[PDB]
Structure formats: C-alpha cells, structure tokens
Design a protein around this ligand. Structure first.
Ligand SMILES: O=CCCCOP(=O)(O)OP(=O)(O)O
Ligand code: SF4
Length: 309
C-alpha cells in the first residue's frame, strides 16, 4: 500500500500565530489564561493547552476581573470586543490577520450605511464575528450559504451593495454563490474573487491532486473545523472514500483493506504530529514509506504581538 501525503497540509500562518499567542501568554504570565472559544478547532491542540492551564470559555461573563483573555483565531464581534473592553481584562487578540481584513471591510460598509452580504455557514464563530462588525441600522448585513439563499434575498438598495466571504469555504461552491449574486444584483461590489484565504485555497488544490491518485483520503482534523470538513467533502465529491479523523485511533481497518493507494492530509488547525501518527498506523496496516506530493510553496508567517515576545 502506497501512502501519499498532500502538499501543502496542516498548519497555516494564522493557526501557528494563534497557538503561539496562547503558549507565550502561559509562559509569560502563568495559568490561568482565558481563551474565548477554542483557540483553533483542534481537540489535540485544545486538550493540550487546557492541561497547561488555558481555560476555554464561550462568554466574557465567564472570565474573572483582572484576568488575561485571548480571542481565538476565528475572530469576535464588536459586541464581544466591547464587552471585553468594558471589563477589567488584558486582552490579546489571536484573530487571524486574514479574518481581520474581512472585518475591516464590513466595518467600512457599516459606517457608510450600505448593505453587505456575507457568504458563509450560519452559526460558525468566524461568521458570528464578521456579521458582528456591522451595526448601522440605516443599511443591513445578510448571510447567504447557497445560490438558493441568494435567489430569495431581498435588500433595501441594491445599487449600493457589497459582498464578503468566510475565509474557509469550498472554492468551487463559493464561486457558484458569487455567480448567483452577480446575476441577481448586477451592481454588487466585492474583492476580485472572494475572501477565501491562501491556506484554504492551497489545501483544497492539494487534496484535489491527492484524490486523483488515492482510492481513500484521510483528513486529519476535528469535526468542528470548517476548513478540514471542506477537504474531506472535496475528496468525496471526486468519488473517493474520505474520512475526517482526529487521530490515528479513529482509523478503522476496513477503510484501508485491499486499498493500493491511501492519501493523507490535514486541515489548517491539525499539528504535524497527528499526521506522523496516522502514517505510523497505516504502516501497521501495510503501508510503505510515506511519499509526499509536490505542492505549491507557502512562505507566509504571521508574528505574535511584540508584547508576547
Ligand atoms: O477561522 C479561520 C480559520 C482558523 C483555523 O482553522 P480552524 O479549524 O480552527 O477554524 P475553521 O476552519 O474556521 O472552523
Ligand atoms: S485558515 Fe486562513 S484565515 Fe483561517 S487562520 Fe489559517 S490562514 Fe488565517
């Protein structure tokens, strides 16, 4: 059995920064360090940081006065930022810069009172944080997930309308949604393509190349990772069996029995150790040396705030 490894895979620049923000805060200030939401949607990273003294909360009212608070990579609404601001907290912001970029545009549209449409998945913390940048009652902020959503949306003034996207979407599905928006609202303004980040685009492109070669694709990542789920979905849509797994213990032998070629990748929030252990388990089930596929080079790094070292 040939084990193939997707390239690029695993940590992106935002996730490396965000985890380093929490670890450095723990090292500089000691436990506890409060984090609003899982810093990244990975169970291994999250359990790890919990055992080291980070406490993960959903609301600022869970956080004691005087505490250090870090916002997760996904970002936070103005309401949350202000509730934190109004309380007695030292705040470090681990929001990915590439999320912050979208935030600034929704804020712009809000200040103008011009309506904005977000493409994204209801209930995801990044969507809550992005929708949460708009506050002007004179305009409006709308969520669409699909072409059918666009087909039913009415806005107040379609001569002044813009759109933004969640950073972790399916590149192909988002393209359908944008085509629908431009047909329904011919004057809508957006970025040249979308707000899907470099890391989501690359890892999708990588998993397409993997799925071309592999009968079975394992995507290392947690159930609540949006970008990880998009990798598994892409492979499955190409007619390959695909599984999203937290770690090597999730592997069922039937998945790989009599399979000549298995592919492995990882979501942007999955550490490389998890992938090494998955390969190790596939080697127990008959795999050889893991072969990495050639991939698009990534060279972006995002530094932690100077205050955190
Ligand atoms: O939210 C932007 C991406 C952050 C890193 O990946 P993670 O799996 O934690 O988040 P998700 O892909 O947004 O659900
Ligand atoms: S997946 Fe993209 S937007 Fe999200 S943390 Fe990583 S680089 Fe930033």
């Amino acid at each position: 059995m040939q084990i193939l490894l997707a390239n690029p895979r695993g940590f992106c620049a935002g996730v490396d920064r965000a985890i380093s923000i929490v670890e450095n805060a723990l090292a500089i200030y000691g436990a506890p360090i409060y984090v609003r939401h899982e810093v990244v949607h990975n169970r291994y990273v999250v359990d790890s940081l919990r055992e080291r003294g980070a406490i993960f909360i959903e609301q600022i009212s869970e956080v004691p006065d005087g505490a250090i608070l870090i916002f997760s990579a996904h970002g936070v609404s103005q309401a949350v930022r202000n509730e934190a601001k109004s309380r007695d907290l030292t705040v470090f912001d681990a929001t990915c810069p590439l999320v912050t970029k979208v935030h600034m545009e929704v804020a712009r549209a809000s200040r103008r009172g011009e309506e904005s449409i977000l493409i994204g998945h209801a209930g995801h913390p990044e969507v809550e944080g992005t929708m949460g940048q708009y506050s002007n009652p004179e305009g409006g902020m709308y969520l669409v997930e699909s072409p059918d959503d666009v087909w039913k949306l009415t806005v107040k003034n379609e001569e002044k309308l813009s759109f933004m996207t969640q950073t972790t979407l399916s590149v192909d599905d988002t393209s359908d949604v944008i085509d629908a928006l431009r047909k329904r609202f011919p004057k809508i303004v957006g970025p040249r393509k979308d707000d899907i980040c470099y890391a989501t685009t690359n890892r999708q492109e990588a998993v397409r190349a993997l799925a071309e070669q592999a009968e079975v694709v394992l995507v290392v990542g947690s159930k609540n990772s949006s970008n990880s789920n998009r990798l598994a979905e892409l492979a499955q849509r190409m007619g390959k069996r695909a599984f999203l797994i937290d770690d090597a213990k999730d592997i069922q032998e039937e998945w790989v029995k009599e399979v000549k070629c298995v592919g492995v990748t990882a979501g942007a929030s999955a550490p490389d150790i998890l992938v090494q252990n998955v390969v190790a388990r596939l080697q127990q089930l008959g795999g050889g040396e893991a072969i990495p596929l050639e991939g698009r080079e990534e060279n972006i790094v995002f530094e932690v705030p100077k205050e955190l070292r």
